[PDB]
Amino acid sequence: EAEAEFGACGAIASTVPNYNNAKLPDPFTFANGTALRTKADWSCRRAEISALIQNYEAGTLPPKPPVVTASFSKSGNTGTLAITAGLSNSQTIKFSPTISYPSGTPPANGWPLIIAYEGGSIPIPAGVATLTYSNSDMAQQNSASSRGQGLFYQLYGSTHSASAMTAWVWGVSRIIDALEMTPTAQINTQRIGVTGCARDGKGALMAGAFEERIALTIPQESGSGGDACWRLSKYEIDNGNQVQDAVEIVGENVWFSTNFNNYVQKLPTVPEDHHLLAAMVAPRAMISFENTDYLWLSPMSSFGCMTAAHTVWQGLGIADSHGFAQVGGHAHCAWPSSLTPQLNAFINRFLLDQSATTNVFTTNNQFGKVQWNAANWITWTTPTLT
Numbered sequence: 449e450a451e452a453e454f455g456a457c458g459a460i461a462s463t464v465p466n467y468n469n470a471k472l473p474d475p476f477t478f479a480n481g482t483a484l485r486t487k488a489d490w491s492c493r494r495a496e497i498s499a500l501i502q503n504y505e506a507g508t509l510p511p512k513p514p515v516v517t518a519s520f521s522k523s524g525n526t527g528t529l530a531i532t533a534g535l536s537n538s539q540t541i542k543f544s545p546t547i548s549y550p551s552g553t554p555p556a557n558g559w560p561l562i563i564a565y566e567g568g569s570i571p572i573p574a575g576v577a578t579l580t581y582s583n584s585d586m587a588q589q590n591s592a593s594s595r596g597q598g599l600f601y602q603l604y605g606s607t608h609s610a611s612a613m614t615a616w617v618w619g620v621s622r623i624i625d626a627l628e629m630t631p632t633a634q635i636n637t638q639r640i641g642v643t644g645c646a647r648d649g650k651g652a653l654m655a656g657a658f659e660e661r662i663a664l665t666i667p668q669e670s671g672s673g674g675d676a677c678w679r680l681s682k683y684e685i686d687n688g689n690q691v692q693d694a695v696e697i698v699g700e701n702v703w704f705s706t707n708f709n710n711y712v713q714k715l716p717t718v719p720e721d722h723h724l725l726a727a728m729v730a731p732r733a734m735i736s737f738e739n740t741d742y743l744w745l746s747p748m749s750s751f752g753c754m755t756a757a758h759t760v761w762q763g764l765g766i767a768d769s770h771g772f773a774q775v776g777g778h779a780h781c782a783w784p785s786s787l788t789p790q791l792n793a794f795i796n797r798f799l800l801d802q803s804a805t806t807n808v809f810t811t812n813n814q815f816g817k818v819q820w821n822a823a824n825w826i827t828w829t830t831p832t833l834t
């Protein structure tokens with residue numbers, strides 16, 4: 449409704465004041481009760497999901513500011529992309545991510561690139577350039593003490609509602625803006641991925657969800673606040689698994705908005721969960737990786753959450769653009785070589801344009817004191833969006 453004022457998607461909701469659902473919110477029904485039926489409907493539902501996530505847990509994601517400039521220099525195989533961002537009131541900040549390049553002549557359209565939060569913890573293939581993004585500089589993340597601290601807040605103000613992870617997303621968007629105006633960086637901006645591990649994996653998921661120029665999203669062992677769902681993690685903690693959950697996470701750090709504190713004890717009233725956050729990547733590609741050795745990561749919650757999110761790609765007819773691999777037997781953020789084929793399949797297909805098959809959806813079902821029962825959490829029937 450009200451398309452003449454708001455555009456093609458009309459008056460998307462940012463709140464649902466009467467919501468109360470202990471199971472997972474339905475991806476395929478808008479807040480107003482309209483059912484999704486077409487693939488185009490997904491674009492508008494994703495916009496509504498973005499507004500709901502910002503309202504309840506992420507804070508405000510500012511749009512591109514009126515000043516974004518960039519200069520590039522290179523020494524050896526290392527480029528430095530010096531970025532400046534500024535507001536209409538003259539306030540400016542600067543940050544300078546570095547890029548590690550393969551040697552020699554690039555492909556005609558430039559190197560594919562993975563934006564790696566704090567360098568990431570995945571093996572990046574030799575034909576893909578790596579941009580090291582210091583997300584902690586953009587928004588600090590030591591503990592609850594870090595609230596409102598970081599370069600982002602030196603631009604927008606320390607009381608700005610963006611969570612640290614939303615601030616990190618904004619920084620990624622500026623990096624891509626910079627790359628698109630800097631041909632000498634020799635990056636194929638149509639083949640950019642994002643990755644990070646642990647808290648930086650929560651960050652990478654947020655980046656892929658909210659920044660649509662990311663072609664491939666790779667969250668690694670992101671746990672609670674990442675590819676796990678709040679409702680499922682509450683079920684785990686109530687049944688004796690020592691998981692991270694919504695209540696603890698908001699006291700531990702600043703990855704979520706202060707407003708989320710008002711909902712962590714009332715999760716059924718939140719008209720979203722992280723299955724909808726992950727689904728915001730669709731129709732682009734994502735594979736996330738989880739580790740069952742650490743109950744803190746909430747293993748069942750990630751499997752159930754990603755199974756729920758997967759229904760969006762299934763409804764869009766592109767199930768193989770979304771992968772999930774969950775295994776045990778390795779240290780946190782250590783990369784197990786047994787998963788390298790799955791990682792490379794997604795990188796090869798979505799960043800390197802190879803005909804790799806990307807049907808990856810596997811778990812060992814090692815969930816501790818709980819089991820996954822899809823009927824207790826997913827109530828919707830996946831439509832075939834037209």
Ligand SMILES: *[C@@H]1O[C@H](CO)[C@@H](O)[C@H](O)[C@H]1NC(C)=O
Binds near residue numbers: 458492
């Ligand atoms: C319900 O909301 C969606 C998203 O704003 C919109 O596209 C749709 O037109 C709305 N339904 C009606 C009947 O206005």
